[PDB]
Amino acid sequence: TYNLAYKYNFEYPVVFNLVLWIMIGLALTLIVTCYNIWNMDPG
Amino acid sequence: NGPEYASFFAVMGASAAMVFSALGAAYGTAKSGTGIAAMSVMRPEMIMKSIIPVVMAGIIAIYGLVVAVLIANSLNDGISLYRSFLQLGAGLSVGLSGLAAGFAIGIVGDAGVRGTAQQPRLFVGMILILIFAEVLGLYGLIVALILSTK
Amino acid sequence: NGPEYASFFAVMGASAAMVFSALGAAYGTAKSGTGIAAMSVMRPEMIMKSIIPVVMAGIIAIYGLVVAVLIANSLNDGISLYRSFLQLGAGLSVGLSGLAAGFAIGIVGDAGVRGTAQQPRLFVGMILILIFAEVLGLYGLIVALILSTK
Amino acid sequence: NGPEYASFFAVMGASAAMVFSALGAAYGTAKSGTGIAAMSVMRPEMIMKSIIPVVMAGIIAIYGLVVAVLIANSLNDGISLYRSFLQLGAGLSVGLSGLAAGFAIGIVGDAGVRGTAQQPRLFVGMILILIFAEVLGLYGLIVALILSTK
Amino acid sequence: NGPEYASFFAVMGASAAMVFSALGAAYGTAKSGTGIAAMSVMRPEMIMKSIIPVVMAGIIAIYGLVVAVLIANSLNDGISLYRSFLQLGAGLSVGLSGLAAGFAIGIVGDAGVRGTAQQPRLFVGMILILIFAEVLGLYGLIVALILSTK
Amino acid sequence: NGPEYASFFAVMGASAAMVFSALGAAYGTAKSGTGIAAMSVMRPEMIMKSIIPVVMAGIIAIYGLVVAVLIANSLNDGISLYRSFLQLGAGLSVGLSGLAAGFAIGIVGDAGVRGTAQQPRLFVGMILILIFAEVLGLYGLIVALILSTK
Amino acid sequence: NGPEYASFFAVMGASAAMVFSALGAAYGTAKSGTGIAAMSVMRPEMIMKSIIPVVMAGIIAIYGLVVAVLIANSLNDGISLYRSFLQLGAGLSVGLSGLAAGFAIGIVGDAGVRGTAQQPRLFVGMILILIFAEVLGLYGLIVALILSTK
Amino acid sequence: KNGPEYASFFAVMGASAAMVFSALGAAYGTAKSGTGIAAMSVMRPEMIMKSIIPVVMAGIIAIYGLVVAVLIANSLNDGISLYRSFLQLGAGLSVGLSGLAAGFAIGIVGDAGVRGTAQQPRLFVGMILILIFAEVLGLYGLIVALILSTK
Amino acid sequence: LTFLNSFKMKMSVILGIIHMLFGVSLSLFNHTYFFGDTMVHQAIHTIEYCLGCISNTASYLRLWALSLAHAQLSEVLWTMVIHIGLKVKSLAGGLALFFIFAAFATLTVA
Amino acid sequence: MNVPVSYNDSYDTRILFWAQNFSVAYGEHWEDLTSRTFGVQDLNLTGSFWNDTVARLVLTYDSLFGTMVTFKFILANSYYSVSARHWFTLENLEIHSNGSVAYFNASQVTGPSIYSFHCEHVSSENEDGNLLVPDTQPSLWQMTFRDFQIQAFNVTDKKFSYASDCAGFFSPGIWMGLLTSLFMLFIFTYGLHMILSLKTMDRFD
Amino acid sequence: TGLVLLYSGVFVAFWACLLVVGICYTIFDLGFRFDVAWFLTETSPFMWSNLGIGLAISLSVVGAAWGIYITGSSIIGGGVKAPRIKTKNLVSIIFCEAVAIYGIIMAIVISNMAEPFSATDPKAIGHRNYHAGYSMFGAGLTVGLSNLFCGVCVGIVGSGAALADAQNPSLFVKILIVEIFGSAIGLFGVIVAILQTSRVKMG
Numbered sequence A: 001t002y003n004l005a006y007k008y009n010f011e012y013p014v015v016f017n018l019v020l021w022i023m024i025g026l027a028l029t030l031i032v033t034c035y036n037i038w039n040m041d042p043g
Numbered sequence B, C, D, E, F, G: 001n002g003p004e005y006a007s008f009f010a011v012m013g014a015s016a017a018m019v020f021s022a023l024g025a026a027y028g029t030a031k032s033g034t035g036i037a038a039m040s041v042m043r044p045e046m047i048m049k050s051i052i053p054v055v056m057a058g059i060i061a062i063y064g065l066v067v068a069v070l071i072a073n074s075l076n077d078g079i080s081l082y083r084s085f086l087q088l089g090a091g092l093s094v095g096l097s098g099l100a101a102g103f104a105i106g107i108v109g110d111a112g113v114r115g116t117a118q119q120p121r122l123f124v125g126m127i128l129i130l131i132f133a134e135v136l137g138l139y140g141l142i143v144a145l146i147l148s149t150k
Numbered sequence H: 001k002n003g004p005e006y007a008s009f010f011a012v013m014g015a016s017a018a019m020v021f022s023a024l025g026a027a028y029g030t031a032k033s034g035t036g037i038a039a040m041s042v043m044r045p046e047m048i049m050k051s052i053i054p055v056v057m058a059g060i061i062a063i064y065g066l067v068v069a070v071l072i073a074n075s076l077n078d079g080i081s082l083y084r085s086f087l088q089l090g091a092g093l094s095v096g097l098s099g100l101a102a103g104f105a106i107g108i109v110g111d112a113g114v115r116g117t118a119q120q121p122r123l124f125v126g127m128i129l130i131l132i133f134a135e136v137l138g139l140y141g142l143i144v145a146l147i148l149s150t151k
Numbered sequence I: 001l002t003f004l005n006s007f008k009m010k011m012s013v014i015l016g017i018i019h020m021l022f023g024v025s026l027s028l029f030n031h032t033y034f035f036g037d038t039m040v041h042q043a044i045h046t047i048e049y050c051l052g053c054i055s056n057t058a059s060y061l062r063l064w065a066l067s068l069a070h071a072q073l074s075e076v077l078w079t080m081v082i083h084i085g086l087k088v089k090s091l092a093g094g095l096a097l098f099f100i101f102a103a104f105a106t107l108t109v110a
Numbered sequence J: 001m002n003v004p005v006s007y008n009d010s011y012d013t014r015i016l017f018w019a020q021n022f023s024v025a026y027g028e029h030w031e032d033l034t035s036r037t038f039g040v041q042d043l044n045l046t047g048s049f050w051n052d053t054v055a056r057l058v059l060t061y062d063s064l065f066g067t068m069v070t071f072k073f074i075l076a077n078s079y080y081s082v083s084a085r086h087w088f089t090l091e092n093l094e095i096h097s098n099g100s101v102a103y104f105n106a107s108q109v110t111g112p113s114i115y116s117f118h119c120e121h122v123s124s125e126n127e128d129g130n131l132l133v134p135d136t137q138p139s140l141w142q143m144t145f146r147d148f149q150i151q152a153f154n155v156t157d158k159k160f161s162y163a164s165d166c167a168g169f170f171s172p173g174i175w176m177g178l179l180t181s182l183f184m185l186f187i188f189t190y191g192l193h194m195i196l197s198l199k200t201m202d203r204f205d
Numbered sequence K: 001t002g003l004v005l006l007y008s009g010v011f012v013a014f015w016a017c018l019l020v021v022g023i024c025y026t027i028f029d030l031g032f033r034f035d036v037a038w039f040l041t042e043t044s045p046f047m048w049s050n051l052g053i054g055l056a057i058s059l060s061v062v063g064a065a066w067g068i069y070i071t072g073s074s075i076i077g078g079g080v081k082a083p084r085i086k087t088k089n090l091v092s093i094i095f096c097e098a099v100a101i102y103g104i105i106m107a108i109v110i111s112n113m114a115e116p117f118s119a120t121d122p123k124a125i126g127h128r129n130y131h132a133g134y135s136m137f138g139a140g141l142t143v144g145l146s147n148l149f150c151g152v153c154v155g156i157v158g159s160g161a162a163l164a165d166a167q168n169p170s171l172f173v174k175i176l177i178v179e180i181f182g183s184a185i186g187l188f189g190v191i192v193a194i195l196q197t198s199r200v201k202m203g
């Protein structure tokens, strides 16, 4: 008995469901918002 | 103790509380600093009384410095994944709100010191909007401090 | 000991401490260096006096260099994964804050020497803003230094 | 020895040190080379005198050259994964910081030689700015040399 | 022997040594070739004098062709993984720095030829900046060779 | 024999040999053909003498066709993986460098015919730079042949 | 026989032969036919004569039609995987080159008819260039038929 | 008989896309043409009720997506098969992207129409005939989605 | 193919060194025929000769590699002349060889 | 605990298998066979077949629902052409009742022969996507492996090789729902781009 | 450009992930994990089939509605000074409306051949059934996207013909032949679409 594998849990797609597309969803709405305040028009 | 990768989110929160907060202080210094040099050509009398928005923008950086050394002194090997996530959200909610804070200080600090040289009645009103632009970062603390001590 | 790939974040923390700091120092040297060329043809005297922002931006590079060597001196084969994430969070917190510090000295160093050419009263005012713009990278040290000690 | 896939990161340290450093040295030559041809219509005397930013940017290319051969000489079949990450972190630290120094030389090298034609007293000060815009790549050396030797 | 996918990376080293060098050779010929037209409408005597920028962009093409026949002739069925990754970084080094060197030639080619049209004293200075622009392609070549020897 | 999906790479080597050389020959036809009509209105004599770049764009089209029908003759069920990568790098290198030669022809071919209407001296100098924009496509062919024979 | 998913790549090759050729026939007729209604107002004589670029672009559409008939009839339920990959590249070879021929036709077909309204001596040269644009559509056809019929 | 538990996602997503994409087009027809009413009415204020014809023709596009969204939502059921749920997703894209398309067509033509009708009243019967050909494209979205949902 | 690469590169590099030797020796006979600014000028005089001759001798390596370009396309040209035209079974000797030998006459010189 | 192994007579070992929880359900009752397997160190493994193309793993327990009842993991090592590899597959899982056979089908427990499979839930009782499926739908037998790792045909040094997990970044439910959600996000961002771009005019007459 | 930086900032980023995800599957051993077989087989044959019926009619009419508003602005634009264009030049509307007919004729045909089944295993779902799935996707793709391109084709020429007829009345019957070759591509779409669905049967 040796070299037992790393025990990934059974909800791995479900984590990549809700962690990747959420962090990028949220990443955008930071950047598109941060862009919109960076060059405003004080004129 | 938690997993071996658990320390990654706490040190990310220790960095994102300092990267984003200094970035907010960077825009507040730069956008209001351009208005300083455009004011001094017309009215040379007010230079100490015109650098109120930049010194209030400096507090945004020290807002991030509080939670950064706080998280790093609560940091440990083998921290729980529940414990490590709180310092991440403490890191994001003080920097990105401070980045939002320095965005407001930078804009109204720019146009405020332009109108102050053209009419000094704006100067009492310019600070009063700047306080509302700065306490957004102060709400960044009491979400970060209430999350880090858990 | 930790895994064999654990040193990957540690050497990347040594790189990001050097890249983003020198990227910040490059913007402060170039954007404010553009302001020296436009002012010197008009006011040719204040040129050894106007190289204060390009030497204040030069501190930001050795701000990144110190934590680069301090991370690189602490590298070993098979360091723990906890110890490597601190050095990645150290290098990101000094370079990206120093890159933000380069954005600040780049703009106000440009606009400050634009108005110093027309009025020499700004030189005590402009050099006062630069301390507030440079201290962000000085804030970047004491979070990076306090992280790599753990 | 180590794994079979380990050589790819040490190759990427050797290649990106020669791409990015030559990518910056190309921009520093091209942006300043436009500035040479622009002032040569009015002021043809400073052509040998004004190629200082081009030969200062040429050091950035040989900055990436010396770290490339030093990494390629350390390349063996099946090196350890800890050793290969040190060469990738060294190659990124010299190429992208050289890409930063390639940017900073190019801007003030363009704007400075626009001003030295109209006023030749800039010639002492313009090269004085470029030293600070050149040592940024030199800080990239002493972190890349200390990382590849480990 | 090596794996089946190992020959893909060495073939990619043969193509990227060609097409990236060809893109720099195409851009340097096209950007400087436009300036030959605007120069000729007033100074048609310096037509044969103005072929020296576009032939030095032709050196970038044969710099890629030299490496491309070296990687293609070292190709064999069942090469090792250490053998193939050496050839991939050999192709990226001559190609991408050649893409940079071809970019730097065409900018000073367009500026110098228009500049030497108004004043023929630039012709001894324009060829000097092009030499430093060309030699960046040589720095990619010499590290492409010593990676392909092992 | 080899894997089932091995022939997919050699098919894509046949397609990218044609569609990139066709895209190169199209832009060299389009950008130069726009310059033919602008020249022919003022100088209608040199209208069959000005179609030297458009046939030189046409030779880039047959350069891809040589490689494309060569690969389709060598295609067979159950080809090995090492054979199929070699045809992928063959079609990529003759394609994208032919796209580079197509871009390089169109810029100076347009610039040449805009100038030869204004001066007949450029018509010998125009065909020089077009040859250097054509040998880039020839360099892609001779490395495509040396990559597809093995 | 072949696997169950094998017919997918033959289906995608059947559609891509038609859509990308339809895109070439779209811009080949829309961009050029804009110039035909443009030409007709100032010179209504060549209106029935200069509809040759919109009928050569129609041959691009039937180039993608025949290979779609060739492929979709050669489909069967569960074909071999080697036969389906060939029909995938058969669709891309005639499609993207027919796409490339449409951008070649519509540019020079619009440019030629504007000079025709200014000087009708161009008309012998303009139709000659449209032959060189049409072989780009023709070269994609003969690679598609030599690939799908294997 | 019972399918997977995630099978009802697609028919629901077909029901939403029948109402999202129809409302995005119908809002374009009311905004782009409704802006042209404002520029028209300052000079020629009489034909204001006469020019809500392109606005009401964009309103039919909204109820074009509403009826099919009702028929999908009434056909929803726990444990529907993958054949049944995907038939309504293809029904949703057929009515949604058509209404998003014909929402643009009534919008630009109705904008340019009422700007030209004010300067020449003869173009009114010509403008309304183009809007018939534009709005009937939304009707083509129905009778494929009505066939697909009934099937 | 690999043996020709190792030999013809170094002998051409020495030939470029020999051409630079006869050229630099002519500068001494031309100089015999007839401090701060002298240091920066002669630095530009010397080190542009140093890195400059490397790019010169690298461009002497092309005249073998262009002959390798000369060799490969001549075989392909040659291949068409020897293979597509002459290896036709029935109708070769008339119209088939005539258009290919015309391509062997006219298309190879351009 | 440790794993059961079928050590061979010649100088090599062969297949081996591990879990944390191993449970079996017949009718309604659930028995934990993990102390009787992995710590017990003595197993009636009667025919542990091996042939380099087909291996077999039998587990008998003689203290179960009534009688002696035997489990059978039937593996295979074929040559699949479309990848040109050797892909092992757990072909069937058989429980031996009074005479009769349970015949559990288990596809997608597969992997390349060089590595070892490992999953987390290899239970029966098909709910959405569990790996084991019986042939008849109201089956009397059910089981559950709350951990799992099994290897055949390439065992070395009495230890497992690299793992081939069943987990995956994408499962075929999330990999159609993404490709349709990403399809009509793109339809939306064409529709949203046009509505975000209709400026009004400035002056009115 | 502000909004173009979003799409060109994502397409470069997403391709940069898929590049480095691509040289990290091969470089370890993990190409067996990729499985384009498992992507085309285990999903469904219905996700391709039902999308193709939707894209058949919807992408045709998004060219038909595109074709209308390009020339419809040019009808009323030239119709202000020259009101005679409103009767003659309505055939340019019809040719950019008959493209929508080519979709709805095709979309009923592809929906007439889709039929359910009971299998849930890609070995039980035979190659007679998977080939029926993708063929509806491919034929629905080439009748939708090609009609989009011929829809914008006849519309752009229709806008030019509305302007040319405003200056001269005799010109419009001469430029109408250009719109035939533009609308011929819509005919070239449906011939492929029925041919890709000729030998197809589900079940």
Ligand SMILES: *[C@@H]1O[C@H](CO)[C@@H](O)[C@H](O)[C@H]1NC(C)=O
Residues within 6 Å of the ligand: J020, J021, J022, J023, J030, J032, J034, J146
């Ligand atoms: C699974 O096995 C564990 C052994 O650690 C046991 O404690 C547990 O009770 C078992 N599960 C059930 C549902 O009985």
Ligand SMILES: *[C@@H]1O[C@H](CO)[C@@H](O)[C@H](O)[C@H]1NC(C)=O
Residues within 6 Å of the ligand: J044, J046, J060, J062
């Ligand atoms: C093992 O199981 C077999 C199955 O028939 C049986 O015959 C044998 O007696 C058993 N042996 C022991 C020791 O339990």
Ligand SMILES: *[C@@H]1O[C@H](CO)[C@@H](O)[C@H](O)[C@H]1NC(C)=O
Residues within 6 Å of the ligand: J050, J051, J053, J054
């Ligand atoms: C291995 O044994 C199995 C037992 O059923 C048999 O079917 C197979 O043919 C054998 N193969 C060899 C090579 O002995």
Ligand SMILES: *[C@@H]1O[C@H](CO)[C@@H](O)[C@H](O)[C@H]1NC(C)=O
Residues within 6 Å of the ligand: J026, J065, J066, J067, J069, J097, J098
């Ligand atoms: C076998 O038969 C006996 C006697 O009828 C019964 O008690 C026992 O439950 C049976 N075993 C199984 C697994 O059904």
Ligand SMILES: *[C@@H]1O[C@H](CO)[C@@H](O)[C@H](O)[C@H]1NC(C)=O
Residues within 6 Å of the ligand: J103, J104, J105, J106, J107, J135, K121
């Ligand atoms: C189930 O197992 C039986 C064993 O006889 C086999 O014939 C059948 O193909 C399997 N079915 C599935 C869907 O795995």
